[PDB]
């Protein structure tokens, strides 16, 4: 129901290869491998004092 | 009554048939309105009657999309003379079987029972096709089952792909979809089906074909019931052109995590399909020559364990799980290709391992003459063993008097497989790759190449 962020994400995956093609709002299967320990060590690695 | 190892006393036994019963020849009769009755006798106790119509999924303008997948579900139902309760009870009273199917160019309605019940079998088949009323409470309960099967079609990824190598690839009629989507099921009702049939089911497009019935019996029954359909001019046949095309759909969002894997395929084109007779039999030989399979099927000596795509792909690349050729011949155009599943981490070179094999047969010396003789023996027997059934026999008289106006004897099919040489395998497969590459994919689409990365590896 928002066909200008449907498209703006689709001008981003088709168009890049590596990091900038990672999707922002994710699909149904990657919501099934996520729990409270994935978030817990993603933050302990990426939330550091020089950032 | 005695136990079944001892014969029963008081029963009459018919006198048996000789050891050599002479086969019958197909008799074709054209009525003044344009309908064609075709009959052929047999040596079993059973008959098989079918009715075949020229209409299909290519006669669908944008107001009547999906209106032949629904005519297959509305097939043997209420008519002007019988309710749906009386049709079901009349077929079960004689122990018959009834069936229908729909194609992109052909509709077909069949019946089979014992040979005693031939006048019953004919007048129920003609009434259910010539006089259907379409009542809204019967159409609406069939639409609700088609709507609950378009809810999931994602469990057959070889008709998902085979439909996607047809829309991407054509422009006009042959790109009309067979099994339709959710929005064209909302504009369909009992009056769309009613005038789609009154326009497209005419006397010059109908053929009645029987197997195991004498020709003078089929004219005492079916002639006083079909002779008064009007003679109308046939329409102009719908046109399309073979363009190229790419298609891809990264799969539905729950199918992965060591799950979807990959399904891709390639395709080509070759201008005539059945009115250029000589060229189509070369490609059926080339299908059994290439062959291949899924290879974890455990049959026996048999299908494809000594084909090119078997002992040169899956016998040394274990990451493949399926590779096979496919042909979809129609009436003027045609399609030949190759369907592959592989792994997601083993994908782009599997396009490579695929394409060369299509390049290997384009070469004039890579194929043996001991490989050509195997594919020409395995093709003449597959035609001959399949024609033993009475149902394949009646289906052959139907779909050959809709394409040629006559039935070709099977001696002319075995004569022209003999002639194929090692250079017809090379020339027609060099006229195959002179056309643009149709590609389709499903599953993990991210790791695959793109159109011009592959299409310039052939010619153009």
């Amino acid at each position: 129901k928002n066909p200008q962020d449907l498209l703006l994400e689709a001008i981003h995956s088709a168009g890049y290869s590596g990091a900038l093609a990672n999707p922002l709002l994710a699909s149904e299967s990657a919501l099934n491998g996520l729990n409270g320990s994935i978030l817990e060590e993603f933050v302990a690695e990426n939330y550091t004092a020089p950032r | 009554a005695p136990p079944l190892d001892f014969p029963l006393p008081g029963v009459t036994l018919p006198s048996p048939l000789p050891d050599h019963v002479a086969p019958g020849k197909t008799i074709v009769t054209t009525l003044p309105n344009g309908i064609k009755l075709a009959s052929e006798t047999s040596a079993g106790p059973a008959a098989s009657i079918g009715l075949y119509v020229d209409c299909g999924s290519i006669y669908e303008t944008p107001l009547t999309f999906g209106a032949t997948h629904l005519l297959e579900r509305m097939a043997f139902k209420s008519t002007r003379n019988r309710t749906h309760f009386r049709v079901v009870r009349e077929v079960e009273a004689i122990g018959g079987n009834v069936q229908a199917s729909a194609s992109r160019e052909q509709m077909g309605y069949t019946f089979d029972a014992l040979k005693t019940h031939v006048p019953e079998m004919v007048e129920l088949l003609v009434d259910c096709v010539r006089n259907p009323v379409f009542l809204d409470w019967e159409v609406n309960e069939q639409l609700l089952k088609v709507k609950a099967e378009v809810g999931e079609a994602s469990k057959n990824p070889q008709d998902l792909l085979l439909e996607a190598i047809h829309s991407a690839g054509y422009s006009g009629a042959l790109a009309n979809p067979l099994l339709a989507s959710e929005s064209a099921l909302n504009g369909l009702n009992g009056s769309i089906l009613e005038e789609f049939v009154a326009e497209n089911y005419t006397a010059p497009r109908i053929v009645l074909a029987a197997s195991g019935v004498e020709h003078e019996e089929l004219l005492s029954i079916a002639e006083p019931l079909l002779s008064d359909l009007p003679n109308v001019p046939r329409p102009e046949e719908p046109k399309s052109v073979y363009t190229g095309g790419d298609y891809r759909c990264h799969t539905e969002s729950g199918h992965i995590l060591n799950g979807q894997r990959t399904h891709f395929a390639l395709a080509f084109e070759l201008p005539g399909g059945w009115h250029k007779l000589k060229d189509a039999m070369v490609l059926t030989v080339l299908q059994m020559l290439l062959g291949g399979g899924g290879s974890f099927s455990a049959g026996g000596p048999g299908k494809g364990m000594y084909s090119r795509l078997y002992l040169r792909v899956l016998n040394e690349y274990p990451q493949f799980h399926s590779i096979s050729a496919f042909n979809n011949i129609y009436n003027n155009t045609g399609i030949f290709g190759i369907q592959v599943t592989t792994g997601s981490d083993f994908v782009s070179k599997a396009i490579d391992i695929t394409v060369n094999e299509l390049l290997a047969v384009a070469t004039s010396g890579q194929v043996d003459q001991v490989q050509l003789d195997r594919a020409k023996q395995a093709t003449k027997s597959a035609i001959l063993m399949n024609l033993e059934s009475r149902m394949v026999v009646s289906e052959d008289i139907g779909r050959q008097v809709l394409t040629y106006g006559e039935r070709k004897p099977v001696e002319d099919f075995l004569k022209a497989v003999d002639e194929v040489t090692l250079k017809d395998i090379a020339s027609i497969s060099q006229k195959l790759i002179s056309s643009p590459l149709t590609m389709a994919s499903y599953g993990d689409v991210i790791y695959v190449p793109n159109y011009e990365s592959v299409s310039s590896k052939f010619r153009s």
Binding site: - | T83, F85, R86, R89, D136, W137
Partner: protein, 117 residues
């Protein structure tokens, strides 16, 4: 038979305008008096009818239950626009009953049964 036709009989052409007079004041048709709770076959004849025809029946029935709570009638402008005896139900109900007499002479379980209270 011969004692119910109003264009031959005189006492049936006065029984006809007595029910016609009494239906117009509530704005009802004669087929609105058929209850799907009385006869289970009337419930089936209404499911085979188009949605726009059944919706006009539910709105004539609500207008009339409102006039009898208030103890009044339709105003005589609206009473000249009323058509009782214009039917929508009798032909579909005869078809459902004809299909049930065929399923019983030939064997076969009934399609819907009444609950035992």
């Amino acid at each position: 038979q011969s004692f119910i036709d109003p264009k031959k009989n005189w006492f049936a052409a006065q029984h006809m305008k007595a029910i016609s007079k009494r239906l117009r004041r509530f704005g009802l048709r004669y087929d609105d008096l058929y209850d799907p709770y009385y006869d289970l076959d009337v419930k089936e004849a209404l499911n085979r009818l188009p949605k726009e025809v059944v919706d006009a029946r539910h709105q004539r029935l609500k207008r009339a239950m409102d006039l009898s709570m208030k103890h009044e009638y339709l105003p005589e402008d609206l009473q000249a626009m009323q058509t009782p005896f214009r039917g929508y139900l009798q032909e579909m109900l005869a078809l459902v009953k004809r299909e049930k007499a065929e399923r019983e002479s030939l064997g076969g379980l009934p399609l819907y049964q009444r609950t035992i209270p």
